[PDB]
Amino acid sequence: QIHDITGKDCQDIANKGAKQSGLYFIKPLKANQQFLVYCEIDGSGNGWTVFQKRLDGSVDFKKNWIQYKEGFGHLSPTGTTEFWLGNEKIHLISTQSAIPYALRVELEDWNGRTSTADYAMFKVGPEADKYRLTYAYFAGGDAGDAFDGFDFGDDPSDKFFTSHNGMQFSTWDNDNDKFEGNCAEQDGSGWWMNKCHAGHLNGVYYQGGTYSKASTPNGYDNGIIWATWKTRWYSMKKTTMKIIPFNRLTIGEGQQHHL
Ligand SMILES: [Ca+2]
Secondary structure, three states: OEOOOOEOOHHHHHHHOOOOOEEEEEOOOOOOOOEEEEEEEOOOOOEEEEEEEEOOOOOOOOOOHHHHHHOEEOOOOOOOOOEEOOHHHHHHHHOOOOOOEEEEEEEEOOOOOEEEEEEEOOEEOOHHHOOOEEOOEEEEOOOOOHHHOOOOOOOOOHHHHHOOOOOOOEEOOEOOOOOOOOHHHHHOOOEOOOOOOOEEOOOEOOOOOEOOHHHOOOOOOOEOEEOOOOOOOEOOOEEEEEEEEHHHOOOOOOOOOOO
């Protein structure tokens, strides 16, 4: 069930010798708190600290501010359960030191195809700044950069309206988006909402992927979307949000060799 190796994060645990993905306790620097996390450890010696997972629609994501702060769902040795680690814990890990983390969003469609999108220098701010999302730049990935916003065509300024960098977190009971209405209440989730969204992984789990305006009384595009990879009417089958020290991603042809 729970492994004995501990560290500041899952990469620290992998560096110590851990070989199996599973449950481990981590103690982020300066927090004086220890908590369980699911580490995804591969053959390359990479250790990903997973903070979000969707795969079967078993966990209700319409939770309030406090629940999104503390975490909900379940952690399993097999990594086959849905959960949200908790905004407070995500903040503690991503800001524990001066070493930057990279966020990898892993997506899987209903046909078994998967894609990724990486963001460098990912951080989640303190509760005082409503767990604001900030990143330096999109680092690559075939899923596309939905966090930069997307032009759905229903407005020239769609891109500026759907960007996520710099947005505070919102829950139905703590609206911090840039919409006159309540993005979180309308979709029924917690997320870094703007004048809503281009990438939204905490949405409603729609079986089969395809859904439409007809699916909900008011016609909201509230599924698990990533506009740069699939249409807004296509909800993902699985999603994973996981972090790793950024230096782990610049280990290959991500460098200039000189002479
Ligand atoms: Ca609002």
